[PDB]
Design an enzyme around this catalytic site. Structure first.
Site, short mmCIF file in Angstrom:
data_model
loop_
_atom_site.label_atom_id
_atom_site.label_comp_id
_atom_site.label_asym_id
_atom_site.label_seq_id
_atom_site.Cartn_x
_atom_site.Cartn_y
_atom_site.Cartn_z
N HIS A 108 1.01 -1.17 -0.10
CA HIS A 108 -0.10 0.10 0.23
C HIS A 108 0.87 1.14 -0.20
O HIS A 108 0.52 1.97 -0.75
CB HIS A 108 -0.91 -0.01 1.11
CG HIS A 108 -1.63 1.41 1.39
ND1 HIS A 108 -2.49 1.81 0.53
CD2 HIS A 108 -1.74 2.35 2.27
CE1 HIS A 108 -3.14 2.87 0.91
NE2 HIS A 108 -2.48 3.14 2.09
N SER A 125 -3.54 -0.24 -4.33
CA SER A 125 -2.75 -1.01 -3.60
C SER A 125 -3.28 -2.48 -3.61
O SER A 125 -2.91 -3.50 -3.30
CB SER A 125 -2.22 -0.77 -2.44
OG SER A 125 -3.22 -0.19 -1.77
N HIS A 143 0.95 5.16 -2.52
CA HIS A 143 1.37 6.45 -2.14
C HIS A 143 2.59 7.04 -2.52
O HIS A 143 2.60 8.17 -3.18
CB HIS A 143 1.50 6.68 -0.55
CG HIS A 143 0.10 6.80 0.23
ND1 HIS A 143 -0.45 7.91 0.28
CD2 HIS A 143 -0.30 5.72 0.95
CE1 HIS A 143 -1.56 7.84 0.99
NE2 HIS A 143 -1.61 6.43 1.37
N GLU A 201 -7.11 8.60 -0.57
CA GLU A 201 -6.94 6.99 -0.24
C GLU A 201 -8.13 6.21 -0.99
O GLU A 201 -7.44 4.98 -1.62
CB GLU A 201 -7.30 6.86 1.25
CG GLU A 201 -6.69 7.35 2.11
CD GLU A 201 -5.09 6.49 2.68
OE1 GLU A 201 -5.04 5.80 1.43
OE2 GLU A 201 -4.36 6.78 3.25
C1 LIG Z 1 -4.49 10.56 7.07
C2 LIG Z 1 -5.15 9.22 6.80
O1 LIG Z 1 -5.66 8.78 8.22
C3 LIG Z 1 -4.28 8.08 6.20
O2 LIG Z 1 -5.12 7.11 6.02
C4 LIG Z 1 -2.98 7.72 6.97
C5 LIG Z 1 -3.10 7.18 8.71
N1 LIG Z 1 -2.04 6.51 9.14
C6 LIG Z 1 -1.06 5.98 8.44
N2 LIG Z 1 0.17 5.34 8.90
C7 LIG Z 1 1.15 4.96 8.27
N3 LIG Z 1 2.18 4.22 8.98
N4 LIG Z 1 0.93 4.72 7.10
C8 LIG Z 1 -0.14 5.41 6.13
O3 LIG Z 1 -0.09 5.11 5.03
C9 LIG Z 1 -1.07 6.10 7.19
N5 LIG Z 1 -2.35 6.78 6.48
C1 LIG Z 2 -5.69 2.44 4.16
C2 LIG Z 2 -4.98 1.10 3.84
C3 LIG Z 2 -5.64 0.35 2.82
C4 LIG Z 2 -4.89 -0.76 2.09
C5 LIG Z 2 -5.75 -1.59 1.16
N1 LIG Z 2 -6.87 -2.10 1.40
C6 LIG Z 2 -4.94 -2.51 0.16
O1 LIG Z 2 -5.29 -3.66 0.27
O2 LIG Z 2 -3.86 -2.01 -0.10
FE LIG Z 3 -2.96 5.13 2.71
#
Ligand SMILES: C[C@H](O)[C@H](O)[C@H]1CNc2nc(N)[nH]c(=O)c2N1
Ligand SMILES: CCCC[C@H](N)C(=O)O
Ligand SMILES: [Fe+2]
Ligand SMILES: C[C@H](O)[C@H](O)[C@H]1CNc2nc(N)[nH]c(=O)c2N1
Ligand SMILES: CCCC[C@H](N)C(=O)O
Ligand SMILES: [Fe+2]
Lengths: 308, 308
Positions: free
Chosen positions: A169, A233, A174, A214
C-alpha cells in the site's frame, strides 16, 4: 487550547512509536493476523522502526520467500489493472519508478532507496514506522514532506486486500504520487494546515482525505479512473471500485466529510471528482478553512515550523 | 549567448577544482608563499578538496603546532577587537558560534562540524575547495546556499593579514553572517541573480560585493563599524579600517561598482553604508537589475534551478 505539534523534523520522532490498527485482529475474514509466524515478522519490522531515529539511513531487510511471492503477485496483477483502471497521472509516473527505483515483480524495493529517490523527485523522505499512525500524526508528518511508511508486507493468504497499510500500500499506493511535484506540494499544504488544529477538524480532514487521496475516483475524459492509494494497492478493490457493485456520488466536501466509511472491507460508496486536479483543489480549499489561533510557515532550509 | 551555469547541487562539482589566486606568490611582502613546507601543506589540503564530491562528509584534519598557534593568535586578537570594531549583527552571533560550534582560541573548528551547524541555522553548507574560486563560481554556489570554503591556514609569519581566503577568513569572516537568516537569504538572492549572467555584470557585482560583503563599513548609531568579512578576519586591517589612514566615502553603487580596489594590501579606500541593513538592500536592488534572457527559480526540496 492548542494541542502540541512538532516544529522540527527531529520532533516527529516523539510520536513515531505510537501505533494503531483498524481493529481486524479478531476478524474471521482476516485470519492472517492470528498467524504466529506472521506476528513474529511484524514484531521484527516494528523493532526496526522503534530503534530508528531522524536522519538515520533506513535499515535494509531480507524478505522471506512467502513475502517475495506476495509482492510479485500483488505487483504483476496491479500493473495489469493500472492500464485500464488507474488515472493518467499515476500511469505516467509508474514507469519512472520501475526504471529508476527498482519497482519490479521480482524485487521488493528497499525503503532507503525509495526515500533517496523521492528526495530527488520532490524532497519527500520516508520514515519507517511499526504500523498505522493516527491521522493527526501522519498528516503532521506531511508538513515536513515526511511520509511515515511501513516496511512489513500483507499476509500471503489474501494478497488481493488487507485493511492495514502494508508496504504494498505504501509503495504502490502512495509513493507514486508523492514523487509528483504538484501532488507533493498539495500533500505538504494540507499537512501544514493540520498542525495543532482542533481534533474535530482533523477527523473531518481525515474523512475527506479518505474519500479522495485514499479511495477517490475521478473522471478522465468520458471514463472514470481510480487515484486513491487504497484502490491502487488492492487488486481486489481496484476491480470492484469500477464495477457495478459500489455506489457512486459526485465529490461534495460538505457531504463527503460527514460520510461514513469502512476500514476493514471494500468501500460500499465512492465519491467521483470532476478531475484529479479538481479533487486536489477542493481538498486544498477546505484545508485552508481549518481555524486556529495562529498561522504556520515552513522553512525548508532549516526544516522548522514558524508560528505566526 | 548565455554561459553555462549549474542547475543542481551536484553540478557545482564541475568547477570545484578551478582555483585562482591574487597573484602574490612573488610578493616580497608575502614570503610565506615561497615556503616549501607551507606549499607542501597547501598541496595536502588541495588534494582533499580535489577528491571531495557533493554530499560527502568533509574530511577531518589534524593541524600542526604552527597552524594551531596562528589560529589562536588570530582568534584571540580579533575577539578583543570585535568588541569595539565589529558591527552589532556580528557580535550578537559570534557568542553562539563559540558555544555551539567550537569556536575557541585553542581549537581550529572542523569544516564538517561548521557545515552541520550552518545547515541547522540557515541551510547553508560548506564545500571544501583548494583555494580561491572565480567570482562567477563562488557566487553561483551561493544560489544553492553553498559556501565553497578553504581548509588551509595562513603562513604563521604574518597572522595579521593574508591576501588569500584562508580558513581564518572563511570561518571568522564569512561563517558568522551565513548563520544569520536574513543575511543567508540575501546571499542566496544575489547568487541566484548571477547564474548565467554576462561577465560584465558579474565583475561589477563582484566589485560591489568586495566593497560591501568583503570590506564594507557601516554606521551604527553615531559610530562606524566593520561588517566586511575581509576586515573581520584581518586583525591588521581591522585596526586600520577605523583609523585615520584610509579614505572613507558614502556607499554609492554607481561609483562603488566602478571603483578600483587592491587584493594584496590594505584597502586605501572604504565605502560607508548608512546601516548594515541599507547595504544589503542596496546590493540586493542592484543584483535584481542584472539583465538576462531568462529568470531563475530555486526549489529547495530538490535543490535544483528552474529556468523560466
Ligand atoms: C491521514 C489518513 O488517516 C491516512 O489514512 C493515514 C493514517 N495513518 C497511516 N500510517 C502509516 N504508517 N501509513 C499510512 O499510509 C497511513 N495513512
Ligand atoms: C488504508 C490502507 C488500505 C489498504 C488497502 N486495502 C490494500 O489492500 O492495499
Ligand atoms: Fe494510505
Ligand atoms: C565573490 C567574491 O569574488 C568573493 O571575494 C569570493 C571569490 N572566491 C572565493 N573562493 C573561495 N574559496 N572562498 C571565498 O571566500 C571566496 N570569495
Ligand atoms: C578576500 C580575502 C581577504 C583576507 C584578509 N585579508 C585576511 O587577512 O583575512
Ligand atoms: Fe571573502
Amino acid at each position: 487550547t492548542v494541542p502540541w505539534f512538532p516544529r522540527t523534523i527531529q520532533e516527529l520522532d516523539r510520536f513515531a512509536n505510537q501505533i494503531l490498527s483498524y481493529g481486524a485482529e479478531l476478524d474471521a475474514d482476516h485470519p492472517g493476523f492470528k498467524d504466529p509466524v506472521y506476528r513474529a515478522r511484524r514484531k521484527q519490522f516494528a523493532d526496526i522502526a522503534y530503534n530508528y531515529r531522524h536522519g538515520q539511513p533506513i535499515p535494509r531487510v531480507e524478505y522471506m520467500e512467502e513475502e517475495k511471492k506476495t509482492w510479485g503477485t500483488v505487483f504483476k496483477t496491479l500493473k495489469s489493472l493500472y492500464k485500464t483502471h488507474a488515472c493518467y497521472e499515476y500511469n505516467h509516473i509508474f514507469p519512472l519508478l520501475e526504471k529508476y527505483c527498482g519497482f519490479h515483480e521480482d524485487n521488493i524495493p528497499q525503503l532507503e532507496d525509495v526515500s533517496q529517490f523521492l528526495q530527488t523527485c520532490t524532497g519527500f523522505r520516508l520514515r519507517p514506522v511499526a504500523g498505522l499512525l493516527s491521522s493527526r500524526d501522519f498528516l503532521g508528518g506531511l508538513a515536513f514532506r515526511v511520509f511515515h511508511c511501513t516496511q512489513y508486507i500483507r499476509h500471503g493468504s489474501k494478497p488481493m486486500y488487507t485493511p492495514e497499510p502494508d508496504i504494498c500500500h505504501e509503495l504502490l499506493g502512495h509513493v507514486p504520487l508523492f514523487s509528483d511535484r504538484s501532488f507533493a506540494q498539495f500533500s505538504q499544504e494540507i499537512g501544514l494546515a493540520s498542525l495543532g488544529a482542533p481534533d474535530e477538524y482533523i477527523e473531518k480532514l481525515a474523512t475527506i482525505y479518505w474519500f479522495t487521496v485514499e479511495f477517490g475516483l475521478c473522471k478522465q475524459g468520458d471514463s472514470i479512473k481510480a487515484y486513491g492509494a487504497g484502490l491502487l494497492s488492492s487488486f481486489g478493490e481496484l476491480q470492484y471500485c469500477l464495477s457495478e457493485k459500489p455506489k457512486l456520488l459526485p465529490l461534495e466536501l460538505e457531504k463527503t466529510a460527514i460520510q461514513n466509511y469502512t476500514v476493514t472491507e471494500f468501500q460500499p460508496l465512492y465519491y467521483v471528482a470532476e478531475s484529479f486536479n479538481d479533487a486536489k483543489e477542493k481538498v486544498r480549499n477546505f484545508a485552508a478553512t481549518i481555524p486556529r489561533p495562529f498561522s504556520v510557515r515552513y522553512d525548508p532550509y532549516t526544516q522548522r515550523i514558524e508560528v505566526l
